[PDB]
Symmetry: C3
Subunit: 117 residues, 3 copies
């Protein structure tokens, strides 16, 4: 039943971009997968998986550097959401592309205007 989509963009120096999954908090267990890439061989980015635990708010599950796939297996309740946080560690603006598990079709609005704070 797999469904990996690709979000592409540009991330400014020191910027952060958050892309949400299963914002509808619908029923969907099993593997989350994502990998972060850049066309820039000198990119320096970190990918962070956040989950809204069960109600306490958002918390990190794990993180990886660019080109290292991030895999995570979950059966926490009913439904629940995840966010992929991309952090540019460099001062250099660069392309990114993120391949990630999606619950439903990729929408423009999956890219959040603001990460969790």
């Amino acid at each position: 039943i797999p469904n990996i989509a690709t979000y592409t963009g540009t991330i400014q120096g020191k910027g952060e971009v958050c892309i949400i999954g299963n914002k509808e908090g619908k029923t969907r267990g099993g593997e989350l997968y994502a990998v972060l890439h850049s066309t820039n061989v000198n990119a320096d980015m970190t990918l962070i998986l956040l989950r809204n635990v069960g109600g306490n708010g958002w918390g990190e599950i794990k993180r990886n550097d660019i080109d290292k796939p991030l895999k995570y297996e979950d059966y926490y309740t009913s439904g629940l959401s995840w966010i992929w946080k991309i952090k540019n560690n460099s001062s250099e603006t660069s392309n990114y592309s993120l391949d990630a598990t999606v619950h439903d079709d990729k929408e423009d609005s999956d890219v959040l205007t603001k990460c969790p704070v």
Copy 2:
């Protein structure tokens, strides 16, 4: 002081095997240790440690590749079980052996019919 038992078996192509620890729900804490091995040199397996944190469900707490020892510390006052999930990423039916922390003594029934879903 570690109590470490070794589970052996055969895992079919693309198959998954879960093994329960502390099924009897005793109160324990301290280091969990496991390491997955295979006699097949082109084996490609993943070991995943799962727990049920409470009013919440089963989820992954960490993972390691074959031959990479998995070490993890917790201390819960209630009697919580853990599950080792062995994933065969290869098509080749392969030997496995799992060295892992056990509470008392290994039993055939520790191999579950179904991983948490």
Copy 3:
């Protein structure tokens, strides 16, 4: 704007020392950071981040070797405390220094008399 303190001490061979943060569980969101160091060039130590889970007890989030920073983002609405556990893997009694995010200022009482059990 981060407040990073440095704890310094000496850790006996095979010893473990735990340092608590945010001990009253005041509400916070953002990154927890710590890195373990030693003036012993040969030091062999592990740093483990533990979180108090839901009153259920303490559980490891992640771990790193000496000299490798540990970062973790939490945006939970209820405050929670954390522990940095320093394990001396060597039999050699060694200096340590831990640079870590603090919420107040560093206090003597942050050095726990005992790690969770």
